[model samples]
Target: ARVGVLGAKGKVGATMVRAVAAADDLTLSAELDAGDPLSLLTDGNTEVVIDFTHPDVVMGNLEFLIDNGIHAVVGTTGFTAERFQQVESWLVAKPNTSVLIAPNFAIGAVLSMHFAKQAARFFDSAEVIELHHPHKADAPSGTAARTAKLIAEARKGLPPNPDATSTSLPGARGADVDGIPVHAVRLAGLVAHQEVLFGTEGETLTIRHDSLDRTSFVPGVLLAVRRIAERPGLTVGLEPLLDL
Candidate 1:
């Protein structure tokens, strides 16, 4: 199979290129950068496209792929629920095309989110902390956001925390997603990392996932690319592919 890569010069894209090149069943067909259009895809030469591009241009990129009847595996973040719904509607018209949008491609990270949700029912308070390299473009990280959403789902109808907070500073408690606080940290020398902290009356639980290198994402990306053809629609999470 032939594959094309967008944002090929970025850190994650570069790693994906190397991984695709090493895979026995796949061949690298094209590499594209910003400002390039869908016509860059060679008609019969590219079978699948992997996009690790910026959020500002991802929607346009997906439109181009769908228009060209090519499958896509997306790893870049910053996609909102509204934007995904738009893509979902567009995909309905093109039944042969499929797309996978993964918030965190590392397998451990995916599992951590799953496990956090399972643990949410026993905890009274929960918060998420996501740390990444200083160059990461998005704040709060998509993984953290997704984790909070899942935890909120698991804790549906639960009573709110009664902890008193009389703070004098603005934004002191971090950003809250359905009563789950999320803290984002960007610093040099740190790769992608996240910790989901759960608190009860006397005990606290913490679940964390760390991506030491970009290679941590390769397995999931490869999995998505290989399966997109069989799954003809826009999938927002990795859980379905993993049978979660």
Candidate 2:
């Protein structure tokens, strides 16, 4: 497959470049950063493009790719429901073009989200904590948001935490998604970490995953790039491609 990488100068994107270079079945066809012409992708015969760009630029990049009939594996975060719906709307008519908007491509992170959602309905109370490197731009990381969404949906309007007590300090309790607490921490040394905490009356269970390096994401990106043609329209999350 011919691959192009956006944000190719950044850390994760650089790692993607190396991974694509090392792969036997893939070729690094186009490299782009902030100032480069996006036409490189269309003219370069890029069958699959990897996007690891800034939050501000992802939508435009995805739009161009879809309109030009390029398959995409996107890692850029900061996607809200409305923005994602807009992408979906744009994708509806492009049946031959497939796109995978993966919030986190670390395989373990994907499994943790799967496990957290599966565990949600069995537990009475649940919350999420996501920690990332200080350099990361967004808070509550998209992985955390996706995890919280899955858990919230699994629980399905069940009675929420009955013991909800007030925190004297404002914002101490973190953000709430459908009454499920989701917290984000940014620190200098952390790469990325997430834990889903669930509690019943007498017991508590915690599901955690850590991504220590950018390489942790490469395999999943490669997997999505390899399989995207099989998945039509707009597919969000890597778990679907794994079929795990």
Candidate 3:
């Protein structure tokens, strides 16, 4: 299979190139940067395109792939619900094309999110902390955002946390998605890390996933590239591929 990689010079893109080169079943066909458009894909010759570009250009990138009948495995985040709905509508006519957008590509991170969602039901309170390298663009990280959504869904109808403080500074409680609070930390030395904490009456549970190196994401990226053609539609997360 011939695979093209978008954002080829970025950290994740570079890792994907190496991984694709090592795979016997796949060949690296093309590498495109931010300034290029759908022309870089070269029609339908490329079987699958792995996009690790920024959020600002992801929508246009996917639209080009869908229009050209090329399958895509996207690891870039920052897509709003309306944008996803737009893609869902576009995919109705392009039945042969498929797109997979995964917020976090590390298999361990995906598993940790699954585990945290399952544990959420038994707890009364939950919070998330995500730490990453200073260069990461998004606050709260995509993994933390996804985790908060999962936990919120699992803890549906649960009562909100009761905090009685007469005076507190604005934005002091971190960011809240649904009822779960998420904290983001960006430091120069950190690579990627997240901790999901759950609390009840007498005990607490914590689940964490850490990526000490960018290599952790390569296995999942390669997996997505291999399987994208089989599932021809807009897939939002990696959970479906993992049967989560």
Candidate 4:
């Protein structure tokens, strides 16, 4: 497979470059950074383009990729319901092209979110704490936000988490995502860690998933790349790709 990479000079992109090089069935057809021309991807005849670019410019990149008939595996964050609708609208014009977007590509991270959703209904209280390196562009991390939403959905029709003390500093608790409290921690030496805490009358359960290294995402990215062609239109999350 001919592979192209956007934001190829960044941290995750650099790791992805090495992973692609080590793969026996894939070739690095194009390497593009922020300033590089989009033509490189099309000129290189890229079958699949992995985008780890900034959220600000990802939509523009996707427009070009979809317009030109190329499959994309996107790991960039900042996708809302509106943006997904926009992507679906674009796909209507280009029927053959497909795009797969995932919040966190690490398999463990995806599984942890699944576990959190499954356990949410049984617990009386649920919270999410996500820690990542300080250099990350977004707070609350995309994974944390997604996990919180999943937990909230799973615990629907139930009373909100029991929290009576409404005192202390402004963000004493954390950001609320779909009624689920999510705490974001930015530190010097963390590489994507999230813990979904669930508490009930008897005991508490913590489901934690850690991406200790950037390489943790490689296999999942490669899996999406290898299967992107078979899945036409827009596919969200690695959970669907894993047949979970």
Clashes found in each candidate (C-alpha, N, C closer than 3 A): 0, 0, 0, 0
Expressed as tens digits, the lDDT of each residue in 73-138 for candidate 4 is 999999999999999999999989999999878888888888898999998999999999899999
Clashing pairs in 3: none
TM-score of every model versus the real structure: 0.80, 0.79, 0.80, 0.83
Per-model RMSD to reference? 3.3, 3.5, 3.3, 3.0
For TM-score, the strongest prediction is 4
* Tens-digit per-residue lDDT, 1-244, candidate 3: 8999999999999888888888999988888887766676775378799999999898888888888888899998888899889888889889989999988788898889889989988888899999999999998886788789889999887777555758879877779988789999889988899999998888999998889898998888888888887787988878787876
lDDT score for candidate 4 against the true structure: 0.92
Q: Native-vs-model 3 lDDT?
A: 0.86
**Model 1: lowest-lDDT 10 consecutive positions:** 35-44
Cα lDDT listed for each candidate: 0.86, 0.89, 0.86, 0.92
Candidate 1's residue-wise lDDT over 95-200, tens digit each?
Answer: 8899999887887888898889899888889889999999999878877888888898899988775568876477677788888888998899998899999998
Best by lDDT: 4
Q: Is 1 or 4 the stronger prediction by lDDT? A: 4
